Amino acid sequence: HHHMSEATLLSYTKKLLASPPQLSSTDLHDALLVILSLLQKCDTNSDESLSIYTKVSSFLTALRVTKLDHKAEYIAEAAKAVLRHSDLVDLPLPVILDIVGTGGDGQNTFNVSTSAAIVASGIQGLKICKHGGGDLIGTLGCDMFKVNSSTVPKLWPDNTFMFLLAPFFHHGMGHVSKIRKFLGIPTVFNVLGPLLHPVSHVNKRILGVYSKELAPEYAKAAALVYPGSETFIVWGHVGLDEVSPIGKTTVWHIDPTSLKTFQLEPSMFGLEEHELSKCASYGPKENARILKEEVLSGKYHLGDNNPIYDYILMNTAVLYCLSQGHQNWKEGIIKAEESIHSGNALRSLEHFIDSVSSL
Amino acid sequence: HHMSEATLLSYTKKLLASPPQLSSTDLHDALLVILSLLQKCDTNSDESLSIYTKVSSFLTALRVTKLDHKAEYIAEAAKAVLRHSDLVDLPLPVILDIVGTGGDGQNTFNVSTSAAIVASGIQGLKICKHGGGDLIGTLGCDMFKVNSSTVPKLWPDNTFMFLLAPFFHHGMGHVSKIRKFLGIPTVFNVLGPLLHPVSHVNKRILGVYSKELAPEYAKAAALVYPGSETFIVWGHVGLDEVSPIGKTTVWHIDPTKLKTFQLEPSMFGLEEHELSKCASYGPKENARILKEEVLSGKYHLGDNNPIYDYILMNTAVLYCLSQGHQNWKEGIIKAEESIHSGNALRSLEHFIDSVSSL
Numbered sequence: 001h002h003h004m005s006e007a008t009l010l011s012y013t014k015k016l017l018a019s020p021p022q023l024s025s026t027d028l029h030d031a032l033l034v035i036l037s038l039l040q041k042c043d044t045n046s047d048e049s050l051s052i053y054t055k056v057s058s059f060l061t062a063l064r065v066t067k068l069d070h071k072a073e074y075i076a077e078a079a080k081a082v083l084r085h086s087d088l089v090d091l092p093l094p095v096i097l098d099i100v101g102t103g104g105d106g107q108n109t110f111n112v113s114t115s116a117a118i119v120a121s122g123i124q125g126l127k128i129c130k131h132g133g134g135d136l137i138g139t140l141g142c143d144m145f146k147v148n149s150s151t152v153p154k155l156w157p158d159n160t161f162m163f164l165l166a167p168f169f170h171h172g173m174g175h176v177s178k179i180r181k182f183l184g185i186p187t188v189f190n191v192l193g194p195l196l197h198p199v200s201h202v203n204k205r206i207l208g209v210y211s212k213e214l215a216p217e218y219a220k221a222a223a224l225v226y227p228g229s230e231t232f233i234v235w236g237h238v239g240l241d242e243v244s245p246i247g248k249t250t251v252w253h254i255d256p257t258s259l260k261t262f263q264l265e266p267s268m269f270g271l272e273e274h275e276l277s278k279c280a281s282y283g284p285k286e287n288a289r290i291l292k293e294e295v296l297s298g299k300y301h302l303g304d305n306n307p308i309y310d311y312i313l314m315n316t317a318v319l320y321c322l323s324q325g326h327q328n329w330k331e332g333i334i335k336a337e338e339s340i341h342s343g344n345a346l347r348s349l350e351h352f353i354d355s356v357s358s359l
Numbered sequence: 360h361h362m363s364e365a366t367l368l369s370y371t372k373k374l375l376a377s378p379p380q381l382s383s384t385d386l387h388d389a390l391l392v393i394l395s396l397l398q399k400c401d402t403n404s405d406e407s408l409s410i411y412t413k414v415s416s417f418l419t420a421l422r423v424t425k426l427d428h429k430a431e432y433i434a435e436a437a438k439a440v441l442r443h444s445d446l447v448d449l450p451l452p453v454i455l456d457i458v459g460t461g462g463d464g465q466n467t468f469n470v471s472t473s474a475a476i477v478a479s480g481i482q483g484l485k486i487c488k489h490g491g492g493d494l495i496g497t498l499g500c501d502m503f504k505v506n507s508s509t510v511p512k513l514w515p516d517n518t519f520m521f522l523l524a525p526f527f528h529h530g531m532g533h534v535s536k537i538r539k540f541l542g543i544p545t546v547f548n549v550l551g552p553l554l555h556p557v558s559h560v561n562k563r564i565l566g567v568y569s570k571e572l573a574p575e576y577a578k579a580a581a582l583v584y585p586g587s588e589t590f591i592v593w594g595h596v597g598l599d600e601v602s603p604i605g606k607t608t609v610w611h612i613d614p615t616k617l618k619t620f621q622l623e624p625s626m627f628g629l630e631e632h633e634l635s636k637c638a639s640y641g642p643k644e645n646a647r648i649l650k651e652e653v654l655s656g657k658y659h660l661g662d663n664n665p666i667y668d669y670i671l672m673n674t675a676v677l678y679c680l681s682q683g684h685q686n687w688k689e690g691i692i693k694a695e696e697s698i699h700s701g702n703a704l705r706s707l708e709h710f711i712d713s714v715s716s717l
């Protein structure tokens with residue numbers, strides 16, 4: 001009877017069981033708003049809670065089976081519906097970039113994403129507002145829970161680097177957290193993280209995706225969620241949501257002043273290829289120590305063929321090149337190298353850690 | 360433990376593959392995992408939340424693939440539910456059943472029970488009707504007394520028996536709450552007619568709600584009842600019975616191939632009646648009409664009483680199925696004779712008395 005009811009949710013699920021399916025991209029937006037209302041108001045241990053988890057499970061599964069949650073317009077409406085339950089950052093009116101992946105690629109490489117974001121943030125004229133999650137920033141002695149829509153505006157003016165932990169912004173993602181665990185299958189939610197940036201001022205971004213087949217739809221989705229933001233969608237050919245240190249990577253270029261694809265190889269950066277096995281994660285604590293006491297403290301050099309160092313330089317070089325409007329990959333390398341050895345990258349990180357500590 | 364959420368999840372994943380990797384025996388095994396897990400959901404705990412999430416996921420994925428519209432899947436689903444059933448063991452006439460899937464959005468009179476009773480008064484015929492009884496319940500019959508253990512006692516001396524489904528199929532009891540919560544059709548919606556606990560039944564009418572379903576539903580009926588001559592019926596107004604208005608398609612399984620023909624009340628010498636004239640007056644009222652207005656002999660062929668015509672027609676189809684011909688007007692004469700001889704009221708009365716002295 002009320003729009004925000006099991007009855008309304010059921011009617012949207014029934015559009016999904018029709019041949020062909022009759023669920024529009026805007027219906028998916030509307031359905032997700034009903035699911036989030038139904039889940040936020042859940043009465044613990046009530047029959048109503050079981051019935052609701054039943055109908056949300058049913059909807060989300062139907063949506064996976066039809067594959068409409070892999071269509072650009074549907075991904076965008078889904079991100080938009082989720083964002084309605086989010087704390088967005090209100091800022092008073094350098095190039096501001098984000099770098100992040102969908103995940104879901106079944107890989108466990110070093111956190112190059114946060115590392116490149118920190119090294120890029122050391123380059124004069126760049127500002128980095130990375131949205132993610134992760135624990136890595138956690139283990140450098142700053143409470144990431146202190147960073148929310150209320151504190152980001154205080155941190156914003158004097159910081160070249162910032163990290164936003166998604167769960168402290170996206171209360172809608174918090175509401176589906178338990179049913180996602182219970183479902184144990186991928187859903188539309190597995191690909192929304194990168195399209196939920198709560199800072200409107202971000203100009204450019206690298207968005208990594210787990211699959212070649214998603215990339216073109218994810219590029220069209222990114223264009224709809226971040227209108228006029230110049231964007232690389234990246235897919236490493238080995239199956240990786242960032243620029244791979246082995247083999248090729250494809251870039252899908254959303255260029256608002258112009259769709260177009262181009263191919264990246266480590267040789268274009270003046271770097272050796274490295275196998276994924278040589279570029280592994282040692283978990284958050286050790287990743288952070290490696291980053292802070294080795295990479296950012298200048299223990300390694302361009303030309304040392306240190307695999308992790310190379311991997312971070314390359315991802316940094318793409319951030320720089322994206323930021324300046326050119327494909328001079330070796331120049332982004334030089335700029336990444338200078339950010340580290342000048343101490344600027346470590347200073348950018350330390351200033352953000354001190355800033356957070358002060359809240 | 361193999362009967363676990365993790366095992367169910369792996370079955371759901373088979374359904375999300377392109378193309379799906381869920382075989383019909385996979386559905387059988389998945390359904391035993393489901394009925395086992397749902398048995399443990401006696402509270403609204405988080406474990407229950409989790410199990411309902413995964414069963415809903417599985418059942419919904421099955422519906423959207425449409426594997427639950429395929430005969431092999433429907434038969435394997437029936438076999439899995441029957442594992443949780445009390446089945447009737449009998450010592451080794453024609454024995455008939457008449458029942459529908461429901462799910463047609465109609466609210467028509469209980470013509471199956473009524474036609475089963477009238478048919479049971481035609482000499483040579485034995486009726487063991489299986490159904491979801493509330494009607495026969497209100498005629499002073501303790502239908503809980505009719506179970507696995509008591510059916511063999513009632514079998515020898517009764518031309519008519521009614522078997523109330525929820526007292527046989529514990530497995531259906533377990534999925535009752537989640538099916539209500541799902542609000543969408545699943546495979547469970549079409550299993551009722553395929554769950555008969557007496558294997559000696561050798562002919563039946565099974566109504567379906569959909570033209571589209573009927574062909575695959577006839578195949579499933581042939582897999583579930585290999586030793587059975589069967590009519591699947593769909594009234595074109597959208598009805599799981601021989602319709603008192605417009606045409607009814609019949610799919611015929613003759614275990615000698617899917618034969619088809621068409622029924623129209625004129626073939627029975629009957630006027631057409633709108634569904635509105637053949638409405639369900641509720642269990643207590645339906646039982647009153649059937650025993651007072653119909654089995655008493657108050658109405659005859661030619662009175663054009665809608666309920667009475669509706670019962671005569673469905674009885675006549677049972678008779679013709681039983682005899683291996685299409686003499687529909689002979690069917691009417693045999694039905695009219697079972698009502699007006701009193702033989703029908705007596706057959707029902709014998710059963711109610713058999714159950715009373717149990």
Ligand SMILES: Nc1cc(F)ccc1C(=O)O
Nearest residue numbers: 491524525528531532551
């Ligand atoms: N709830 C049921 C119980 C039975 F024994 C047989 C069928 C059903 C049904 O819901 O159709």
